[PDB]
Design a protein around this ligand. Structure first.
Ligand SMILES: [Cl-]
Ligand SMILES: [Cl-]
Length: 257
């Protein structure tokens, strides 16, 4: 059971492929994100690293997550002394999903329950699926291969559905990429990832931002990042319109051998 190992054991260099993943978007400052699986539990803050090295590659590892913030209320004790009573306000709760590759990884949050209108401690059930962090060894835009084509194959996973097949292709001469998502339960999500050019972002990493097409029809967008010194992997997300509103999908692919 490498989930509890990911929750209790420290980092290791002889672990396979991607060792660590910094949790920045999954937890904000002053928040506590508690993950539990296989009878183990660990609390995470803002800079904290998740030991993805113990997780299996190319699969979606699942934890139970609860997101809390701590408040110290002011009370008067037996005497007239000030006593602070710490109370943990549960902000969110659900399933925490992690997809691990060799040079990249991403987390997704399946919110099952949140606080209520005007709060007051009551939890209401409201589902949401969003992407957390997308981290790894970003490929430099200025160190991309000068030519050749590359076929990345991988997984597209959304709410209650992790069987999506992602297929992306990058021509490094034209510096362009395009792909498709297949075999998802929801038919409106099996979309084409339209051709768009490779761009450098603010830190000059290699990223691709294109349109999501459903029967040659624009119904959202997708963002991918290139990871690995030799552009081994891609990882990102997609926002797709459906009859049930907008859905979010996690994307992660790698070249094969
Ligand atoms: Cl008094
Ligand atoms: Cl949703």
């Amino acid at each position: 059971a490498g989930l509890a190992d990911a929750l209790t054991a420290p980092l290791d260099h002889k672990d396979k492929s991607l060792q660590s993943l910094t949790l920045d978007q999954s937890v904000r400052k002053n928040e506590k994100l508690k993950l539990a699986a296989q009878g183990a539990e660990k609390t995470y803050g803002n800079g904290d690293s998740l030991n993805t090295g113990k997780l299996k590659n190319d699969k979606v590892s699942r934890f139970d997550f609860i997101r809390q913030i701590e408040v110290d209320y002011y009370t008067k004790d037996t005497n007239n002394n000030l006593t602070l009573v710490p109370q943990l306000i549960t902000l969110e709760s659900g399933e925490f999903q992690v997809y691990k590759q060799s040079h990249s990884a991403l987390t997704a949050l399946q919110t099952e329950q949140v606080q209520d209108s005007e709060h007051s401690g009551k939890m209401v059930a409201k589902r949401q699926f969003r992407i957390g962090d997308i981290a790894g060894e970003h490929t430099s835009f200025d160190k991309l291969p000068e030519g050749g084509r590359a076929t990345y194959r991988g997984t597209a996973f959304g709410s209650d559905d992790a069987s999506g097949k992602l297929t992306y292709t990058i021509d490094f001469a034209a510096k362009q990429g395009h792909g498709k998502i297949e075999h998802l339960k929801s038919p409106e999500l099996n979309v084409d990832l339209a051709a768009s050019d490779i761009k450098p972002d603010k830190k000059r990493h290699a990223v691709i931002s294109g349109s999501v097409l459903y029967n040659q029809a624009e119904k959202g967008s997708y963002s991918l990042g290139i990871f690995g010194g030799q552009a081994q992997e891609v990882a990102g997300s997609a926002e797709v319109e459906t009859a049930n509103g907008i859905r979010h999908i996690g994307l992660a692919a790698k070249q094969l051998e």
